Design a protein around this ligand. Sequence first.
Ligand code: A1JEQ
Length: 337
Amino acid sequence: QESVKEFLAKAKEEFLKKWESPSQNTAQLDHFDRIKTLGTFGRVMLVKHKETGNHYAMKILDKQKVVKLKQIEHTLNEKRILQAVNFPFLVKLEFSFKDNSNLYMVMEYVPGGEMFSHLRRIGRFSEPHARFYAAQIVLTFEYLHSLDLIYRDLKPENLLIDQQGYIQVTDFGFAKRVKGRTWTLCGTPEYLAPEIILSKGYNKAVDWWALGVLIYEMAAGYPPFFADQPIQIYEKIVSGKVRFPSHFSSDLKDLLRNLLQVDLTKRFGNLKNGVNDIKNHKWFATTDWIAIYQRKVEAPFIPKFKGPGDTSNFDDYEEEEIRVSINEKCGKEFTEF
Ligand SMILES: COC(=O)c1ccc2[nH]c([C@H]3CCNC3)nc2c1
């Protein structure tokens, strides 16, 4: 429909303006009070802005460790993309800056926790619950792919649940602007598409494979390919031999066979009709795509939390210093940050 085409054309226009002229250096560390480590080359810490009182999740990357782990380009991708995107189910970057030691990305805080926590607490999501989340990912990937962005890190740990019960996708550390193919081995083993494992030039079809893994994990409670060693996971993935729980609906199994298609040229999301083969699949027949985008659907689950500074949906980590060297480190490598 023309209304969707015009939406995506405007979305790309607005992305490209920010992409071509990124914001830089929009706060500094002593504008914030450190509250708690929420997850831990990098950590995420809950901080409070000292003037406004607003809460944020501050991702901190050690420049020397980024260089050693060969993640310079990836880190620059992450911040350049995050400051340029705008979509209801993406985390909101409010500030970024750097100092002698670290890179900082300060995002609006999402107190409801990772989807992974809730999935493991409940066991598995019902198909309507899994479908509510999946629809948000389908729309988010339609948006990102229209901007020539691949995401490359879908998994329940990267999907935050907000105060309305909707998703905010976080961690763009592997996201990249790609026209055509790309080649970097990255991702999480359980979620890797076969063509990544086989060191091929691959494209945005790897995100649709990962959506199949996510939907399986949400509806079953565990991922389709797992083993104690990644090499064993990889052998299962490239076989693509998938066993479905008997409680899966026939529509769900049919969608998953088409997302977990080892031949990328036959995989849903990567055919001539693109995302519409997924949106029009029988498993999504009850989904009101517009209502999801507009956040008008009542969510199946609202996280329990007491206020915008509550950390009870995240877990406990050793609290370490945020050290800033007296000397500048790796200044040249991160000039554009
Ligand atoms: C807006 O962002 C936040 O509120 C936020 C909170 C906790 C987080 N934990 C992580 C790690 C663990 C999963 N992969 C990245 N990202 C987080 C982001």
